[PDB]
Amino acid sequence: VLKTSTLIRLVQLVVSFVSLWLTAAGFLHLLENSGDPFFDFGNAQHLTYWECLYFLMVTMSTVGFGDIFATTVLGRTFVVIFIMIFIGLFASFIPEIAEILGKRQKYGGSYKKERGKRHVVVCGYITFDSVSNFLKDFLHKDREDVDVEIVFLHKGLPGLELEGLLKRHFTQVEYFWGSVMDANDLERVKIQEADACLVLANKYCQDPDQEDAANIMRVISIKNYHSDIKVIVQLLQYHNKAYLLNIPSWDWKRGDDAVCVAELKLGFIAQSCLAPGFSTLMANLFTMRSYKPTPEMSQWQTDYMRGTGMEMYTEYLSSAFNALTFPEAAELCFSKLKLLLLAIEVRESTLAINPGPKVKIENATQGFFIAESAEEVKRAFYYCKNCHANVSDVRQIKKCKCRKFDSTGMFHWCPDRPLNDCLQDRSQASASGLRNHVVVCLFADAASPLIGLRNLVMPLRASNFHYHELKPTIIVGNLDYLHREWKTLQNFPKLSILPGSPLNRANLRAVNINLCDMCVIVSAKDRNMEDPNLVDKEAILCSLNIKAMTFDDAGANVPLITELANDSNVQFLDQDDDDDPDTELYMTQPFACGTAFAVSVLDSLMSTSYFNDNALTLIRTLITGGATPELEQILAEGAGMRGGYCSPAVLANRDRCRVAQISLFDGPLAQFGQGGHYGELFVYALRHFGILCIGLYRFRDTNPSSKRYVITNPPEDFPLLPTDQVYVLTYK
Amino acid sequence: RQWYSFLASSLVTFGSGLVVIIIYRIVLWLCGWMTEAKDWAGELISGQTTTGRILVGLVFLLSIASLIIYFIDASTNSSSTTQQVDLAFNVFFMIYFFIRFVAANDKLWFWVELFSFVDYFTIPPSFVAIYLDRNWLGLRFLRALRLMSIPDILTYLNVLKTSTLIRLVQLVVSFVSLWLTAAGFLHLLENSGDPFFDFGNAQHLTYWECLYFLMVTMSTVGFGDIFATTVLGRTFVVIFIMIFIGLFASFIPEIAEILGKRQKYGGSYKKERGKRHVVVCGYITFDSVSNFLKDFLHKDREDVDVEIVFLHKGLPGLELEGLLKRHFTQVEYFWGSVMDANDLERVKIQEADACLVLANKYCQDPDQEDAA
Ligand SMILES: [Ca+2]
Ligand SMILES: [Ca+2]
Ligand SMILES: [K+]
Ligand SMILES: [K+]
Ligand SMILES: [K+]
Ligand SMILES: [K+]
Ligand SMILES: [K+]
Ligand SMILES: [Mg+2]
Ligand SMILES: [Mg+2]
């Protein structure tokens, strides 16, 4: 009848205790009532058997009321023996029962599904920090208020902070014990009926390979249980993404997005090398924020914090936009509705970013907007040319009543090379007249794991750029490390590797870091293996070393961007600002100016991949420079990049929209920088050139350090300066 | 049949209440409002909406106020200010009882919950009391279990933050509620007596005497100043002894750990006008400081009024504490690292003269020490 060690130990504990307690009671019942032969059976207090149980449990527990006591000689000698023994039983009896009856797992049961409500199964790394970041993005005021429950399936029992968070979000969120590997725990959660499944990941760990290996197995166990299901995964290393693409059930078509952190992280940084500060333009568009201007802030901060409140949104355009060109449509969204229209999905649904006048708007077209909230974008859905054409107040539109190339033709390809062709010393690097280029200051041991600098270099070598226009990249690190990554990196032109650490000024002066477009600082070393303060020692010391240097033909004017493991270590980068660890990473001066880029800002990207399936694949076109699924399956087949010369049909895919900065100092746009506003600039640039002004990169000090800060989609009436730089989607 | 009338009124609600929903789990076994009211009632109880925070805030205060009426009535022992106002609390709680019935997922499993049980033994006898014109304590003491929701109530409002304060409030309130209920359970059994001997034996303890009695037997002191004479009372004491010793054994030591975690050498360095000071930091032990203070504070140097401020992460040892106290006027010790900018405003390093970073010379490796 008894199975498991707990129930056998429990029954042994209870029954042995009860039997011995009952016998001892009866032994006193004998001795007390009989008396003793020492005094001719004279002394004999008349206790019942039931009075002796009360007496013994009391003396066993070491309470000892003295309400009943032993008068007899033989009885008292038994009490002395009883006291020595049964205190020993009672001391181990109750605590061991408490351990056995405490082991019942609390958050068991099973998720009972309601009819109309659809739900999501979150799993993997689930702590207070991972969930609190997730629930702020997923459950938020700005999104369309859809009834979507969340179900946290997890092995461990939750902490006291997490329990409080789960109780505050009572109606939506529910927590459940058990792993994703057991098929019984999936029938429990009802993942078959569920909409999607989100595998979160521990970014800060001992090694990333064991973490992703678990998350890959989590996917396999879900797909083994049921094939037709959306599974979104948070991976860390890019080479681990090849394993998910070779699972047969894993289908790209139905929205199985592997949110690879290293692909995006370096991609965001790579686009900053082309147009500085773009790293923190895009990072703010995906964290769901709201504008709360406190009076302590200065002029530059309040304009930045408005930019944080803008986000990506998908919503259908009204019938007013039908039979109408793109630039005229994007103008109506900006001028009247006050919404920045980026892209329109055209019915295989192609995702065209900022097309010219040829691409018309069909009926029921999904438009991609940058706006303050989802309900603000809903003004596009309720627009009418007959009714709303004379209304200046925009809140009144609530009325519903109306050379070598890759096989894909996306990147600049090369034939395979050995490392010694692209290797350089301090003599050869200084001989090469390097200017307007990228410098990857790479910190790594020989044994340290791969980042995939391939993901940094790839978007720099996009087919949008001509061969002469490409910014020549110089990586600075170990040969032992880069010998691994050379397998992937070999098929990229204008790439140069220089050995030694980038802390040495002799290395940097040979590179000409003073004449650098963007010096990217990366650390491949193990993240959190010792302390939180000593993690970004190399990353901070390299940035401070470059700021401190002076050149003689430009010290602090060297533009650089630092990857960070810790968010709190952002304060040590810049030397002139107010620092508080209470203040979040996005509000800090180094981040706002595109000098820093932590990984933590991409926690929100797991939520957006669920809600807006196309919003994730939008930015992969805009960031990596056309990383098509076609490429991912070619790379999964294992022979690296390939191509040749290619046909003119394939090479007509060089035309897509890259990001670029336009300074308002020279050229035709300079007239607007003197006196006029941002709204006047946007309309003039759109008609003539085919340009969508996303935001500004304005100087912090204007009254002098050269630190510029991001302003994503400012108001219509926002004054410009002649020193400003404007982010733009081009057709050049 | 006084004990039978008030006790049956609770069991009639509980007993016939299962018959209501057993019918609806057989009728549907053979085979809007369920979704909308459930989500509305959940937001109301969970304290998310500001209208919900009124009901959460009232259930906090009204539960304590209803328990105060029991203490006042049970202390002394047709229509008075104590009895008639008690309905205002019970009529409020029966509305709160129907709201939870809507909010919960399982409907049959709701009727066998703790707070659902509390409602059956508290609310019907209070209505029957004015119907029958008889004040009976009976099972009023179970109003102490309404305190148990305070850890939930405060986490619904987000007053409690950090794991220490949530664990502390859970420890204190659960202990106090269970200790108050147990006292009232004896107060019933001791004063009522028992049906074994026709309610003959019945020692007249107050509710307050039972608290003193239980805390004593809970603590394993057992004076025998007050004791249990009754059969049902003694059986409760045997059960109480087996359980509440287990609570009391883990209650006090875990509170000692929580109230011991307050860091002693906190505060902030208050700077005098003329005196300038120095911020010593890094490796700070008895050996490093004692060598430093012999050189820095010495007879041979020019006697300049220079205070020393030891900013350090760790809590100092017993030898170091004695050394810091001997040098009372000059030397001061402070918790917190040099990395946190709040701990620098604390020490006032901006106004300070210098900062001395000491180093552990004898270590596992020198590179990690210098890196710090
Ligand atoms: Ca917003
Ligand atoms: Ca700083
Ligand atoms: K004792
Ligand atoms: K004792
Ligand atoms: K005693
Ligand atoms: K005693
Ligand atoms: K006595
Ligand atoms: Mg629910
Ligand atoms: Mg002083």
What is the dihedral sign for C-alpha A228, A234, A236, A238? Answer: positive
Say what angle helices B50-76 and B163-192 make with each other, to 10 degrees.
30
Closest CA to A123 of A29, A21, A221: A221
**Side-chain-facing half-sphere of A465: CA atoms under 13 Å:** 21
Best of A17, A93, A136, A170 to disrupt the B interface by mutation (most B CBs within 10 Å)?
A170
Best of B170, B232, B234 to disrupt the A interface by mutation (most A CBs within 10 Å)?
B234
> In angstroms, rounded to a whole number, what is the distance separating the alpha carbons of residues A672 and A681?
6
Phi then psi dihedrals of residue A339, to 5 deg: -145, 130
> In angstroms, rounded to a whole number, what is the distance separating the alpha carbons of residues A449 and A360?
48
Say yes or no for a CB contact (<8 Å) between B167 and A160: yes
Say yes or no for a CB contact (<8 Å) between B341 and A116: no
Burial A82-94 (b: 16+ CB within 10 A, else e): beeebeeebeebb
3-state helix, strand, coil in chain B (%, to 5): 60, 5, 30
Say what angle helices A261-274 and A278-286 make with each other, to 10 degrees.
140
Chain B: residue nearest A577 by CA? Answer: B341
Q: Which residues, listed in sequence order, are joined to residue A437 by a DSSP beta bridge? A: A516
Token readout for A252 is 């790209």
Total residue count of chain B as it appears in this document: 372
Q: Which residues, listed in sequence order, are joined to residue B282 by a DSSP beta bridge? A: B358
> In angstroms, rounded to a whole number, what is the distance separating the alpha carbons of residues A27 and A681?
102
Amino acid letter for position B39: D
> In angstroms, rounded to a whole number, what is the distance separating the alpha carbons of residues A685 and A138?
36
Closest CA to A399 of A419, A413, A379, A416: A379
Going by DSSP bridges, is the β-strand pair A340-346/A350-353 parallel, antiparallel, or unpaired?
A: antiparallel
Chain A: residue nearest B42 by CA? Answer: A171
**In A, which residues are within 8 Å of B341 by CB distance?**
571, 579-581
Check whether A178 is labelled as a binding-site residue.
no
Strand order in the sheet with A311-316: A311-316, A366-371, A340-346, A350-353
Closest CA to B336 of B309, B361, B354: B309
Look at phi and psi of residue A449 and say left if phi exceeds 0, alpha if psi is from -120 to 50, else beta: beta
How many CB atoms lie under 10 A from the CB of residue B123? 20
Question: In chain A, which residues are followed by a C-to-N distance beyond 2.5 Å, i.e. a gap?
Answer: 347, 402, 553, 703
- CA–CA distance from A415 to each of A346, A469, A490, B62 (Å)? 36, 20, 8, 80
Secondary structure E strands in A79-225: 118-124, 148-154, 173-177, 196-200
Distance from CA of A539 to the nearest CA of B (A): 13
Best of A63, A145, A146 to disrupt the B interface by mutation (most B CBs within 10 Å)?
A63
Chain center to CA of B206: 26
Burial class (CB in 10 A: 0-12, 13-18, 19+), A215: buried
Experimentally, how was this structure solved?
Answer: cryo-EM
Chain B: residue nearest A50 by CA? Answer: B231
Say yes or no for a CB contact (<8 Å) between A61 and B234: no
SS (H, E, C) A103-124: CCCCCCCCCCCCCCCEEEEEEE
Closest CA to A283 of A725, A585, A707, A729: A585
Question: In chain B, which residues are followed by a C-to-N distance beyond 2.5 Å, i.e. a gap?
Answer: 31, 77
**Contact with chain A for residue B369, Cβ under 8 A:** no
Phi then psi dihedrals of residue A175, to 5 deg: -110, 145
Number of H helices, E strands in chain B: 14, 4
**Contact with chain A for residue B220, Cβ under 8 A:** yes
What residues make up the domain containing A298? 105-732
Phi then psi dihedrals of residue A439, to 5 deg: -130, 105
Closest CA to A570 of A606, A532, A605, A602: A532
> In angstroms, rounded to a whole number, what is the distance separating the alpha carbons of residues B356 and A116?
66
Residue ranges in B133-281 assigned as alpha helix (H): 150-157, 163-192, 207-218, 231-260
> In angstroms, rounded to a whole number, what is the distance separating the alpha carbons of residues A156 and A125?
10
Token readout for B122 is 């508290």
> In angstroms, rounded to a whole number, what is the distance separating the alpha carbons of residues B361 and B359?
6
> In angstroms, rounded to a whole number, what is the distance separating the alpha carbons of residues A574 and A596?
10
- Whole-number Å distance, alpha carbon B221 to ligand 3 midpoint, is 5
Helix (H) or strand (E) holding B91: helix B81-103
Say yes or no for a CB contact (<8 Å) between B43 and A170: yes
Closest CA to A59 of A48, A73, A69: A69
Give me the torsion for CA of A359, A363, A368, A373, rounded to 10°: 150
- CA–CA distance from A346 to each of A313, A353, A686, B116 (Å)? 16, 10, 20, 58
Amino acid letter for position A574: D
Ordered DSSP codes for A424-472: --HHHHHHS---SEEEEEEE--SSSPP--THHHHHHHTBTTS-TTTS--
Q: Provide the terminal-to-terminal Cα distance of chain B, rounded to the nearest Å.
A: 80
Nearest Cβ partner for A168 among B46, B106, B337: B46
**In A, which residues are within 8 Å of B155 by CB distance?**
163-164, 167-168
Shortest-distance ligand to the CA of residue B308: 9
Chain center to CA of A433: 40
Phi then psi dihedrals of residue A112, to 5 deg: -90, 115
Strand order in the sheet with A230-235: A173-177, A148-154, A118-124, A196-200, A230-235, A258-260
Token readout for A490 is 């070999």
Chain center to CA of B32: 40
DSSP code of residue A570: G
Say yes or no for a CB contact (<8 Å) between B246 and A98: yes
Token readout for A73 is 């000689």
Say yes or no for a CB contact (<8 Å) between A170 and B48: yes
Pair B156, B47: CB distance under 8 Å: yes
What lies within 8 Å, CB to CB, of A38 at 6+ separation is A73, A74
Ordered DSSP codes for B213-231: HHHHHHTT----SS---SH
DSSP code of residue A573: T
Q: Which residues, listed in sequence order, are joined to residue A312 by a DSSP beta bridge? A: A370
Token readout for A321 is 């936009």
Going by DSSP bridges, is the β-strand pair A311-316/A366-371 parallel, antiparallel, or unpaired?
A: antiparallel
- Whole-number Å distance, alpha carbon A158 to ligand 8 midpoint, is 19
- Whole-number Å distance, alpha carbon B105 to ligand 8 midpoint, is 7
Helix (H) or strand (E) holding B312: strand B306-312
Ordered DSSP codes for A216-248: HHHHHHHHHH-SSSEEEEEESSSTTHHHHHTSS
How many CB atoms lie under 10 A from the CB of residue A126? 20
SS (H, E, C) A415-426: CCCCHHHHECCH
Look at phi and psi of residue A2 and say left if phi exceeds 0, alpha if psi is from -120 to 50, else beta: beta
> In angstroms, rounded to a whole number, what is the distance separating the alpha carbons of residues A2 and A8?
6
**In B, which residues are within 8 Å of A163 by CB distance?**
155, 166
**Contact with chain A for residue B371, Cβ under 8 A:** yes
Phi then psi dihedrals of residue B204, to 5 deg: -90, 80
